[PDB]
């Protein structure tokens, strides 16, 4: 009973067509700014990306390793940790996961920022799981 928990990132965007898109719907699972950054409470966790953005454009989107050393997904690659939490808002002393998209790839805009907190340790673990709509 319990042990498996997931954190997920939903991003939808809507289209000068090749400009800052107006429809931003960055979404963080189970996240309440007021409550504060979500903190994993389980031994195992998996990371996934969501194309809420409609596949109607040459535009493309990605999250690039930046301030944080550990890139998304690589995180799932059996990376150990002591404690971790995530919040859309910059968390002081936090890794920065730029959330960005490019029309086609020729042009780019700094649409989103995700920030994370690192706590060194061994209990928490990088983990892989598959894909389903839920």
């Amino acid at each position: 009973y319990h042990k498996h928990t997931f954190i997920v990132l939903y991003v939808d965007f809507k289209p000068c067509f090749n400009c800052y898109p107006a429809g931003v719907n960055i979404t963080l699972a189970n996240f309440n700014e007021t409550k504060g950054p979500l903190c994993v409470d389980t031994s195992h966790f998996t990371t996934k990306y969501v194309a809420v953005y409609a596949n109607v454009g040459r535009w493309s989107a990605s999250i690039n390793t930046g301030n944080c050393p550990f890139s998304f997904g690589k995180v799932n690659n059996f990376v150990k940790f002591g404690s971790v939490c995530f919040s859309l808002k910059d968390i002081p002393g936090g890794c920065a996961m730029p959330i960005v998209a490019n029309w086609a790839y020729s042009k780019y805009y700094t649409i989103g920022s995700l920030y994370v907190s690192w706590s060194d340790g061994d209990g928490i673990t990088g983990v892989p799981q598959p894909v389903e709509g839920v």
Partner: antibody
Amino acid sequence: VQLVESGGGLVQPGGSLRLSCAASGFNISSSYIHWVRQAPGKGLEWVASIYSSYGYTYYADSVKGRFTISADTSKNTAYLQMNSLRAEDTAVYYCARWWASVGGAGGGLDYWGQGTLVTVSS
Amino acid sequence: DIQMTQSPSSLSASVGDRVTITCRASQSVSSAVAWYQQKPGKAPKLLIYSASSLYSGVPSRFSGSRSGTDFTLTISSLQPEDFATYYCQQGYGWLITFGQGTKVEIKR
């Protein structure tokens, strides 16, 4: 590098008052700052914390509207405003700091002020 | 949606003996665990963070450990100066809560 609670005393029920947290040694903007109450001969419970730089206000389920937190950077000092005080509120009030070696995550409360007493009675 | 239960409520023991205090994580968590010491009518004092992190000025005998949800604080040898109330805290720069706490007494 020390902290001092100030403005502790008595106020009558329904009164409102503000508390002073003096700091020495560090710029308050760089660290989280919390306030904790100690019920007389009872356990402590978390009240709220504030990060000056990003103006993050985080309160406890106990007192969303009842109290509010602030701090002035030029003052280099933290404030705590309270209203419509109730009998349960009567407690000792300590302000204190937070630090992490990792930085982003897991941390602790290192330094405390002496703490002041607040009473609500006629 | 997270808290902790601190056991025991209170205890006494002989001097230099081993003392264990635990907190069971109401809904288990990560490494946000911390233990503090408060002397009577005195300012609370920092002891341990994430079980394994001791601030400078902490004597060696104190130890903190994790066993899943149960978080243990162990003082190897009871010292008289140690007499006080001790509380366990789970949280980060945001949130946090406290357990009933355990005052420790010296049997002499």
